[model samples]
Target chain A: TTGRLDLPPGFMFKVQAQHDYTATDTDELQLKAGDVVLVIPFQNPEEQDEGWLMGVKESDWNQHKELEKCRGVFPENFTERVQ
Target chain B: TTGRLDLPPGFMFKVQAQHDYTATDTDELQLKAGDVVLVIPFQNPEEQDEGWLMGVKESDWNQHKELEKCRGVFPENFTERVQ
Candidate 1:
């Protein structure tokens, strides 16, 4: 399926399937600074398909608050398959 | 009396007491780029005893938007103890 993804800068789309991670579809995403993205998580448990988009730092990983917010929502170790 | 304080960068500590004002107890805070904090406001009419911790910047106070959002929740002269 296809949907629009908009995100702020310092973030990118990270996807996951049942317990596996995958790279992003760079062709479909025209990234820029300070942009927000809309990511659709995978949906099939058997196939291990689920996805969620997050803001990532292009250079320094410790810059944005959105990332921390995301971590607060989904802490590390509580894996959900992200890119 | 105490709480788990955590905060982001560009912030500092301020305190108020019973309608009066006071500077921070710098000895109690070890600020860094990304730290969270827990503050307690003064308690008492005779002496304002409520305190709260917030993030602020040294240069260009205009750079911070927390004050704007704060205005949304509380107008310019909002009565409350904050530092």
Candidate 2:
């Protein structure tokens, strides 16, 4: 891994999946109810598409830090904020 | 790792360290000239302090895949964008 987050200690943007979500493309992440997600903004400065939020599954984010291996968008309505 | 970026295929925000940079705090990443960094945004919605960018050393990100172990901020002027 590289290092640690630059935010205030313990600060994070998280959510809990409320329903199952399947990825429609390689750029999307799948989810099952009760799963946790570590939400992050798209690295792009451009406006995001409606209804989607980018993140990594909490389990994966904790287990794997590869930005190219785990990090994608999911339907915002499928999860509730935990931050 | 979790998955992959939600942006266009192969899209990424990268930079190459032009000089040595030592971390002053645990929230920072260290770098030597020629090192690659994968820059990411602060997960927080608040404005960031001027002249800093969050990222992980490319080698560690590719090797360890552990977010808690790697991912921090570095001086923006210390590196040049490779995107």
Of the candidates shown, which would achieve the greatest TM-score relative to the real structure? Answer: 2
lDDT for each residue of candidate 2 in A12-67, tens digit (9 for 90 to 100): 58889875655645778878889888778777747366557888776765555686
True contacts kept of each: 0.00, 0.00
Give the per-residue lDDT digits (tens) of candidate 2, residues B1-83. 33244322232588998756666568788888899888777766463555678887777766656765688777677689885
Q: Which stretches of candidate 1 lie over 4 Å from their true place?
A: A13-72, A80-83, B1-83
Residue by residue across A8-78, what tens digits does model 1's lDDT show? 44333542222111222331222332332333332333533122233232222234345333321111111
Residue A31's lDDT in candidate 1: 35
Each model's TM-score, in the order given? 0.16, 0.42
For model 2, what is the C-alpha lDDT against the true structure?
0.70
Docking class of 1: incorrect
Say which candidate scores most in DockQ: 2
Quote model 1's TM-score: 0.16
Could you list the iRMS of every candidate?
22.9, 18.3
lDDT tens digits, residue span B1-83, model 1 = 23324443333343222211112233122233222222322223443212223323222133343532221110111123345
